[PDB]
Ligand binder design. Structure first.
Ligand SMILES: Nc1ncnc2c1ncn2[C@@H]1O[C@H](COP(=O)(O)OP(=O)(O)OP(O)(O)=S)[C@@H](O)[C@H]1O
Ligand SMILES: [Mg+2]
Lengths: 209, 187, 380, 240
């Protein structure tokens, strides 16, 4: 990540933040990732809730690809077969331990970058995570933010993460949003939440209407 | 002799429903107390809401089971009192209702159930005419105590808390959540 | 000792057994390495030791024993088997050994098998005269409705289409409807939470590999599970394989198999294409006793074209195909290539009565589902 | 071949074919299959408004009586022979005896009713009168099974894509009311088994967010069931 972004992260987070710039080699990236994942595992071993925000898994996968020794089995775009094994483990460490504590990983991915490497990395990581969120450039072209594709996003097995009534409240919201266009849906949602004060207030406002 | 076991089952189902009500009330008041507080324990509030939902489902299930047990006790007591009344006045009832009764002994099933429904209708007007005086109806000899402890009808709370119904999807999800909560309590 | 209960038991009390036995450096390595510490300490001690596992041969001569509860991974919990024992009992990969083993010594760092009490719930010499699968010609000499006995089934579905719950319900139906049959569930590169819920929800044993551990791991676990199925069907017991998913297994073999010099569409080679037919052929039919019935799952419209390529290559291999999307159902049921010819060729006009070799018996048939449609190709 | 294998006993059914598809000899084969496999049932071959030579061939290559109307006379002959055959079928029902009817064709009868029915002002797209609809509905629903004794059953014949517009409307309303409908041509098979109207309705909302089992209800099963021809697949549309 660029140094100015690194220092902005430094100054805009309460928790500790670690970054390796593009100036430093890929071995630096992989060792930083190993340090972070090992520290997270050690902390969660003590029944601690650890959260890791990763930006980005694509660059980490590229660094692992360009640091791992070759194996003779290269995919399209120049991605080695066993190169992606290490990042997946890093992204597979996220779990909810029954003994105590949890390890949550929110890792962002890059798409439509004009690269075959990034596309291959996305395809190999597409069906892995259990929570997922798309953003789109064309929604941000209207400068309405956040540029979130509501219809195409979602979470799996959300039932265990919420109570009953608000679940079908959100289902009704999804049924309302789905026919609308994604830009239209986003602007509608922004306008509706603008005049409310709380998600519960928005829920009651939409169900009374 | 199954009526005593049915009465015991009704009693323990009532106790289970009452205790369910107690921890539901305790969780509810604790959640309101935490809401009154100024702490930022949002995750605590979310898990408290989950607890409220799970306990409400458990209370509904316990109330339904208690209602079923109450109905079973009433049915078995009615059947037993019916049997030891009919073993006394069967000849008299047969003499007063004879035609369709020896029609049953040799007629086909169509005539059998036609006579059955004619007899039940006739006794229906018989009862609705007899209830005109409406004297204080007393319980039986040995089942009076059981019927008094069980009561004429279940509690109003145990019936109004069961107005809401859950489809098997909700039943499955709440069973899974209750099992998870039981595992949490065990640990 | 009783390695089954020693390994199956959770670490919570295995650790206490560890300090009670006389060990000091425990709760520090993986769950198999602490068993290796138990191995070394009991080798220092002395007492007759049982050894169980699924035997597998390695190319240079010595064999190992995979553990079902270990998700079929190689590690310190391996049973050394000498080539003499392999040749005297003509041992092949997949046998369930539950025999008497010996403590390690100078040269061998782990348990070594000395004799077998019973070969897969059968006497060793008694099973020495069993017919192999290849020379036994395939002939027939709710699981019952969907696939029955001896047939091969596959379920093609998109993501977020209830695949995992469908597999769950199939598993419970197998459990209570067919208690006698042996349940076996295999998962490929699935999420750890899904693996845990599969293991804790079904009655039968589950062998699963997560996406973290590499593709060759999936290769070896698939080989071990198919060999185990073959060696449980040999002694006339029926087994059902719950494979999820064939697409990811094909991906793993494609990304691990050495290139043959020629490439098909999707970056696949002939070896990775003719491997998966081995699993189906081993489950094609069973003759006199038991069965091997495989129900696999396949992914569609996942965003990458190679998985539709492998699906189209797997169109005709199976006999029962459970579809959850209309887009591929219409293609598989009604191929368009013949229509591409016919549209320009006008039903091929080869004979006035050539239309009586293409009928469709289109009856509405009754089932427990209730008055379901039906179709038939009368393609003479 | 056997009617019990295809049409069974007591339930109605249709076969629909385009022009130049092999109707006459298929009906012949069905006729002798009925004659040999079930000689007890009373054979009844019926033809409406087609070439006299084929009428003679039908009535000469079978054993049962073949009341037929060639294409010379007007449609009043066709309609009145329709009522008299249905009345004799009802009489045979009162006679406590099974009957099989091979009618050809119901599209011919339907549009004959259309061109003969008096005007009532209930016409629709294409000038199709409502009376010319539910009179054929009465005739087609008179083919119900006899629950007291015996079983009447009919096999229907319909023509599709004849270069006209009247036939497909009655075809789609038969689709609405059809019990079983054998098909020969290409496109109409997919039209029926995978309704394009339903597909467009679904696609208007794209992938509709059907909650819970509503998404899993739509199931498709292909079982390669054992058949005397040898491994003839059967495809079933399982719904909830
Ligand atoms: N009969 C049903 N009963 C209860 N929930 C159902 C039923 N059918 C569908 N669902 C819901 O369908 C949702 C998605 O089902 P899943 O099985 O998770 O989809 P999926 O096919 O497994 O796709 P994956 O495995 O997550 S990629 C679940 O959250 C269920 O709540
Ligand atoms: Mg699933």
């Amino acid at each position: 990540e660029r140094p100015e972004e690194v220092t902005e992260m430094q100054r805009l987070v309460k928790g500790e933040v670690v970054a390796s710039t593009f100036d430093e080699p890929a071995s630096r990236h992989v060792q930083v990732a190993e340090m972070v994942i090992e520290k997270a595992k050690r902390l969660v071993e003590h029944k601690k809730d650890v959260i890791i925000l990763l930006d980005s898994i694509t660059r980490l996968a590229r660094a692992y690809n360009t640091v791992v020794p070759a194996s003779g089995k290269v995919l399209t775009g120049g991605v080695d077969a066993n190169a992606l094994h290490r990042p997946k483990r890093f992204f597979g460490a996220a779990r909810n331990v029954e003994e105590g504590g949890s390890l949550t990983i929110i890792a962002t991915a890059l798409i439509d970058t004009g690269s075959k490497m990034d596309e291959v990395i996305y395809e190999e990581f597409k069906g892995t995570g259990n929570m997922e969120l798309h953003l789109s450039r064309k929604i941000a072209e209207k400068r309405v933010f956040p540029a979130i594709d509501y219809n195409r996003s979602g979470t799996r097995k959300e039932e265990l993460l919420t109570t009953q009534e608000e679940l079908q409240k959100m289902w009704i919201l999804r049924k309302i949003i789905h026919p609308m266009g994604e830009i239209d849906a986003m602007e509608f949602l922004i306008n509706k939440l603008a005049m409310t004060k709380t998600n519960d207030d928005f829920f009651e406002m939409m169900k009374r209407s | 002799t199954a009526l005593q076991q049915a009465f015991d089952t009704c009693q323990n189902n009532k106790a289970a429903w009452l205790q369910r009500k107690n921890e539901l009330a305790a969780a509810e008041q604790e959640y309101l107390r935490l809401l009154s507080g100024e702490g930022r324990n949002v995750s605590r509030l979310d898990e408290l809401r989950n607890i409220i939902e799970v306990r409400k489902w458990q209370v509904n299930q316990a109330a339904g089971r208690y209602i079923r047990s109450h109905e079973a006790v009433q049915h078995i007591s009615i059947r037993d009192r019916l049997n030891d009344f009919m073993q006394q006045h069967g000849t008299a009832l047969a003499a007063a209702l004879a035609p369709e009764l020896m029609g049953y002994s040799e007629l086909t099933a169509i005539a059998r159930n036609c006579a059955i429904q004619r007899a039940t209708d006739a006794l229906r007007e018989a009862l609705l005419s007899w209830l005109a005086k409406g004297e204080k109806i007393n319980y039986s000899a040995q089942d009076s105590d059981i019927l008094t402890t069980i009561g004429f009808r279940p509690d109003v709370a145990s019936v109004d808390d069961s107005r809401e119904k859950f489809t098997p999807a909700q039943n499955m999800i709440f069973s899974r959540k209750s099992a998870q909560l039981a595992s949490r309590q065990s640990v | 000792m009783n390695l089954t209960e020693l390994k199956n038991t959770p670490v919570s009390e295995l650790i206490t057994l560890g300090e009670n036995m006389g060990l000091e450096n425990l709760a520090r390595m993986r769950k198999q390495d602490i068993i290796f510490a138990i191995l070394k300490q009991h080798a220092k001690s002395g007492e007759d030791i049982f050894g169980d596992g699924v035997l597998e041969i390695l190319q240079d001569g010595f064999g190992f024993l995979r553990s079902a509860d270990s998700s079929y991974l190689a590690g310190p919990d391996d049973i050394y088997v000498s080539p003499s024992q392999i040749r005297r009992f003509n041992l092949r990969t997949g046998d369930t050994i539950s025999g008497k083993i010996r403590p390690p010594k100078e040269g061998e760092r782990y348990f070594a098998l000395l004799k077998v009490n019973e070969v897969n719930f059968d006497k060793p010499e008694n099973a020495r005269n069993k017919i192999l699968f290849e020379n036994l010609t395939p002939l027939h000499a709710d699981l019952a409705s969907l696939i029955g006995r001896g047939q091969r089934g596959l379920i093609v579905a998109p993501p977020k289409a209830g695949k995992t719950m469908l597999l769950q319900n199939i598993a419970q139906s197998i459990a209570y409807n067919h208690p006698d049959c042996v349940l076996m569930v295999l998962l490929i590169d699935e999420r750890p939470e899904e693996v845990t819920e599969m293991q804790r929800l079904v009655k039968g044993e589950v062998v699963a590999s997560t996406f973290d551990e590499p593709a060759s791991r999936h290769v070896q676990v698939a080989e071990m599970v198919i060999e185990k199925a073959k060696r449980l069907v040999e002694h006339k017991k029926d087994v059902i394989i719950l494979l999820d998913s064939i697409t990811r297994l094909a991906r793993a073999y494609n990304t691990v198999v050495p290139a043959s010099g020629k490439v098909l569409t999707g970056g696949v080679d002939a070896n990775a294409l003719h491997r998966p037919k081995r699993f189906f052929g081993a489950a094609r039919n069973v003759e006199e006793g038991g069965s091997l019935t495989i129900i696999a799952t396949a992914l569609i419209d996942t965003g990458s074209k190679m998985d539709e390529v492998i699906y189209e290559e797997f169109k005709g291999t199976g006999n029962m195909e459970l579809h959850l999307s209309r887009k591929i159902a219409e293609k598989r049921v009604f191929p368009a290539i013949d229509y591409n010819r016919s549209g320009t060729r006008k039903e091929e006009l080869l004979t006035t009565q050539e239309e009586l070799q293409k009928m469709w018996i289109l009856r509405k048939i009754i089932h427990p589902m209730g008055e379901i449609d039906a179709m038939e190709f009368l393609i003479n």
